[PDB]
Scaffold this motif. Structure first.
Motif, PDB file in Angstrom:
ATOM      1  N   UNK A  22       1.065  -1.402  -0.039  1.00  0.00           N
ATOM      2  CA  UNK A  22      -0.070  -0.172   0.038  1.00  0.00           C
ATOM      3  C   UNK A  22       1.090   1.678  -0.210  1.00  0.00           C
ATOM      4  N   UNK A  25       5.460   0.912  -1.752  1.00  0.00           N
ATOM      5  CA  UNK A  25       5.995   1.826  -3.225  1.00  0.00           C
ATOM      6  C   UNK A  25       6.161   2.882  -3.022  1.00  0.00           C
TER       7      UNK A  25
ATOM      8  N   UNK C   3      -7.358  -0.821  -5.076  1.00  0.00           N
ATOM      9  CA  UNK C   3      -5.916  -0.702  -5.314  1.00  0.00           C
ATOM     10  C   UNK C   3      -5.376  -1.438  -5.385  1.00  0.00           C
ATOM     11  N   UNK C   6      -2.310   2.047  -8.029  1.00  0.00           N
ATOM     12  CA  UNK C   6      -1.865   3.043  -7.233  1.00  0.00           C
ATOM     13  C   UNK C   6      -0.504   2.120  -7.737  1.00  0.00           C
ATOM     14  N   UNK C   7       0.451   3.341  -8.006  1.00  0.00           N
ATOM     15  CA  UNK C   7       1.566   2.763  -8.175  1.00  0.00           C
ATOM     16  C   UNK C   7       3.690   3.862  -8.408  1.00  0.00           C
ATOM     17  N   UNK C   8       3.456   3.936  -7.388  1.00  0.00           N
ATOM     18  CA  UNK C   8       4.985   5.507  -7.396  1.00  0.00           C
ATOM     19  C   UNK C   8       4.916   6.511  -7.422  1.00  0.00           C
ATOM     20  N   UNK C   9       5.303   7.225  -7.382  1.00  0.00           N
ATOM     21  CA  UNK C   9       5.319   8.918  -7.296  1.00  0.00           C
ATOM     22  C   UNK C   9       5.920   9.341  -8.598  1.00  0.00           C
ATOM     23  N   UNK C  43      -8.338   5.475  -0.211  1.00  0.00           N
ATOM     24  CA  UNK C  43      -8.645   4.183   1.054  1.00  0.00           C
ATOM     25  C   UNK C  43      -8.007   4.755   2.434  1.00  0.00           C
ATOM     26  N   UNK C  44      -7.484   4.092   3.270  1.00  0.00           N
ATOM     27  CA  UNK C  44      -7.131   4.835   4.652  1.00  0.00           C
ATOM     28  C   UNK C  44      -5.378   4.609   3.958  1.00  0.00           C
ATOM     29  N   UNK C  45      -5.674   5.870   4.109  1.00  0.00           N
ATOM     30  CA  UNK C  45      -4.061   6.925   4.170  1.00  0.00           C
ATOM     31  C   UNK C  45      -5.009   8.196   4.259  1.00  0.00           C
ATOM     32  N   UNK C  91       5.263  12.646   2.838  1.00  0.00           N
ATOM     33  CA  UNK C  91       7.070  11.809   2.395  1.00  0.00           C
ATOM     34  C   UNK C  91       6.516  12.137   1.131  1.00  0.00           C
TER      35      UNK C  91
END
Lengths: 65, 46, 93, 73, 113
Positions: A22, A25, C3, C6-9, C43-45, C91
């Motif tokens: 979650x 990544x 989910x 979703x994958x990386x910045x 989601x939970x974030x 972050x």
RNA sequence: GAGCUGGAGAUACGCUUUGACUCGGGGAUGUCCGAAUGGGGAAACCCACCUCGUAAGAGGUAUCCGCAAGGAUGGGAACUCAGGGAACUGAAACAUCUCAGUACCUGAAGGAGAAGAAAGAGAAUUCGAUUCCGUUAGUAGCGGCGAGCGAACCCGGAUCAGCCCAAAUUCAACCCCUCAAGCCGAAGUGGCUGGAAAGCUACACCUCAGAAGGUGAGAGUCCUGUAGGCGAACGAGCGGUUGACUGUAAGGUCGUUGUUCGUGAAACGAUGACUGAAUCCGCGCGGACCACCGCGCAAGGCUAAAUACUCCCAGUGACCGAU
RNA sequence: UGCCGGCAUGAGUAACGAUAAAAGAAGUGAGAAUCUUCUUCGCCGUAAGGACAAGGGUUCCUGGGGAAGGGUCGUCCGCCCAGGGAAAGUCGGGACCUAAGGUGAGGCCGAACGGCGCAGCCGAUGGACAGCAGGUCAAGAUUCCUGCACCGAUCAUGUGGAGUGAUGGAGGGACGCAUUACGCUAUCCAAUGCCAAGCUAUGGCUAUGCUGGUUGGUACGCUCAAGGGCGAUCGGGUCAGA
RNA sequence: UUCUAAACGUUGAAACAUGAUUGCCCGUACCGCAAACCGACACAGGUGUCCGAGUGUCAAUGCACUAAGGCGCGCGAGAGA
């Protein structure tokens, strides 16, 4: 993990992917991830639902026949 | 002026391009005349 | 799922220089369109996403003297984010 | 492929190579020819096992009126 | 690649972790071979045998010093192995107790460890 | 087996001694194209329409034969034929010809199909199932009568085995028996010029097992083979007694292709239009026919074995040497 | 008078490319004549401009080093090295139609392979926008900031209070050539029209002598239709646009 | 925008106004009748499309030169039999 779902069908693990996978990544990123830390705790727990979706289409095939 | 060829290869697709030797059955062996016939790769995908 | 997109910045210097109001840039999958890349980051974030973008950008790896070496294609998804989700630390700077 | 006659057909052999006025008598002949041909029959029919359209033959209807497969037209 | 190894010696030499031996083959003959991990499939080994001299630089990293001890060379096994004593009698014999992982009993004049 | 996943051997990162590390066999995620075939249809790419469903999105779309599902068609390096068909050359040039039925095209299946148990070869008043080479015969013939192609008479073995259209095969226990991971496998050393010399020297041990080879100087006492023998889960593979099946219903004329026979002094395969007679002591021919003998009888196929082939797995040869 | 591999010599001459001028201050540093901050010169500018078409695919950048290349070389490359740069509901494919032609199970025939074609898909540049100008870094733009057009669109209420499903015939989008003007601005030009930053010993003027700079679609008006074509309630197709 | 049959249809199906809502991936950067795209190479070759300031000149895209913009081209000097 572990091999604990060798005896458990009831969609609990259904969101187990949402766990470490979650924001790991968000540790798989470049820098401030892990160069001298404990770098290995990425795709060293990314087979977390891979090779574990075997006997999941060869065991979990239990529908009704 | 005009050379002798120039780009745009439509007549090397659905005619003489990879899968176009079935329309001409005795061209299938021709397609297979440098793959299942002798050594070497092919000539349509480099 | 909810989910699995979703994958990386995206990490840029003119990101939170040009990407501060809220907009990001993602790092999706070869699967374009948009009917997945969103609820992934939902989601939970405590972070919400909408106004997704998706673009392209190839690769190009002409390294050896000859020419043997190349591509990777890959994509990204810019988005937007209006007033409603600022930062409260996480972050990224 | 619904071209040649369903029966047995003729093609795939047949050539020529005859002479020109000389058949052992006064002067040994030359030759002069040496080429290809082929043969095909005709039409008219009804039914036999596996209907499509019809081609039949020539020498395949004369006595070819017994070994049926389900017809009576 | 820098052809050294001695991988043309063929991987079946038994050695493992923890052992006391001597040496031969020349150059030294005054060197109690010991300790080490060995490297099945291409093996490196030096022990305190050959006193190399191989000065590393001194960037701004952490090394700044040089050294002159502990470094690679060559020469695998084939010197003076086995025998708590010193010579004679092989050792590759193994008790009918399975556990190939570390079978212990050798020849007549052999040892069980 | 206990340690680290192939060449920029990749530093690092990480896992050990009841299974990380490599893996033997029976399976699986299997992207665009390949038969792939939803459609577009220029390999990596755009569309409808029904099942699903917290507003998102999940189950799929093409032709042929018992036809109402399904089963099949894909690509193939050398093995048989069949539709298959020229040709530079030679004859010292030169249309019958030699190349031949060869180049090529197209159809088939197994890695075996092809001829192979018959209206037969021979010839003293004998002999049975195809082909190959052995010897003959390199004879007879052929033949712008030219180069030239070339059986049968006597021979070897693999084989000298039965039945087919209208009055056996399928799952399995046991198996002589193969297939990769893999198990052990023999028997002493010192000194020199020197890189430890297996060269000078010294003695024993190992023997059904003493071919190639690696470790700085060719080593039986460092080691992988060789003789002695083993290995399961999956399956084939050459199987041996047997369980679920029932192992006995057309000659001919004229024009011609072949055959050794360029066709004419000759039956015999068969076709172009015409003849479907014989019909049993009747019928097929001995190279046209006369006379007598010889043998075989409309009528449809199976026959494994050898002959001829060479993608892979050990091993093997008085070859090359990385234009 | 072979073939490749290497050394050759023609030999240091002929030649550096269309003969369409350039000097220098200064940055740098290894020296600088051809880089860079720049005042002076000149060649093209219906061009040797910028965008669209094919192409190369890595050009453009943050820049970086000579081994080699750019036929001098060089501290310049788009050489070579990691990263960065072409942000979509309307500009772009398809699906809605199509001429060459290809293909199309059945089929028209061919010795096979196949040739072709009925119901068809394609195959195109082709029929199909309902926004224009500004705010943009190292590179990208009508997708990024602002006043702004919405073609049909996702639901539901309010005049409709009831209509509608195919290949369509429609009107028509379906335009040949040439002439004449009966129309036209952006853009251009009349600048002292509006406002001026201000003026030169040059000689000369300061004032009707003077640099420069100032509209855009959504929208709709007897101050936008300049100009081209007559509209409607009753009866029937003395039998087909299946 | 030209017209509907089985069926559909009476109180709701659609054409209306409006808030809400949409056009999917790919190009949209480079030179571009251009030493970089084809001429064995960065050789003075090459064909489409749109604008296309200027005074002067019957028009003139022939003809002079500045815009914007492209630029001295793969060189440099002497003496110049």
């Amino acid at each position: 993990k572990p091999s604990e779902m060798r005896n458990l069908q009831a969609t609990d693990f259904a969101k187990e992917i949402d766990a470490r996978k979650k924001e790991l990544m968000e540790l798989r990123f470049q820098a401030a991830a892990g160069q001298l830390a404990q770098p290995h705790r990425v795709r060293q727990l990314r087979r977390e639902v891979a090779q574990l979706n075997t006997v999941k289409a060869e065991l979990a095939r239990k529908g009704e026949q | 002026m005009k050379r002798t060829y120039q780009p745009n290869n439509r007549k090397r697709a659905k005619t003489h391009g990879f899968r176009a030797r079935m329309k001409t059955k005795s061209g299938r062996n021709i397609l297979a005349r440098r793959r299942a016939k002798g050594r070497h790769q092919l000539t349509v995908s480099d | 799922s909810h989910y699995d997109i979703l994958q990386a910045p995206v990490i840029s210097e003119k990101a939170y220089s040009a990407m501060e109001r809220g907009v990001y840039s993602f790092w999706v999958s070869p699967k374009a369109t948009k009917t997945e890349i969103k609820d992934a980051i939902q989601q939970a974030f405590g972070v919400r996403v909408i106004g997704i973008s998706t673009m392209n950008v190839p690769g190009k790896r002409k390294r050896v003297g000859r020419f043997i070496g190349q591509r990777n294609d890959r994509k990204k998804a810019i988005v937007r984010l209006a007033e409603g989700q600022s930062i409260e630390a996480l972050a990224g700077q | 492929m619904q071209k040649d006659l369903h029966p047995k057909a003729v093609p795939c052999k047949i050539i020529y190579q005859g002479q020109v006025v000389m058949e052992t008598m006064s002067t040994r002949p030359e030759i002069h020819v040496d080429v290809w041909s082929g043969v095909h029959p005709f039409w008219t029919g009804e039914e036999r096992f596996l209907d499509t359209e019809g081609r039949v033959d020539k020498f395949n209807k004369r006595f070819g009126d017994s070994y049926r497969r389900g017809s009576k037209k | 690649p820098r052809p050294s190894a001695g991988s043309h010696h063929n991987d079946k030499l038994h050695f493992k972790k923890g052992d006391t031996v001597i040496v031969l083959s020349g150059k030294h003959k005054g060197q109690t071979g010991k300790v080490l991990l060995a490297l099945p499939r291409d093996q490196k080994v030096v022990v305190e045998g050959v006193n190399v001299i191989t000065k590393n630089v001194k960037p701004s990293m952490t090394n700044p010093q040089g050294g002159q001890e502990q470094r690679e060379l060559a020469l695998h096994a084939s010197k003076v192995a086995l025998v708590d004593p010193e010579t004679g009698k092989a050792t590759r014999v193994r008790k009918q107790i399975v556990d190939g992982k570390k079978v212990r009993v050798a020849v007549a004049s052999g040892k069980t460890i």
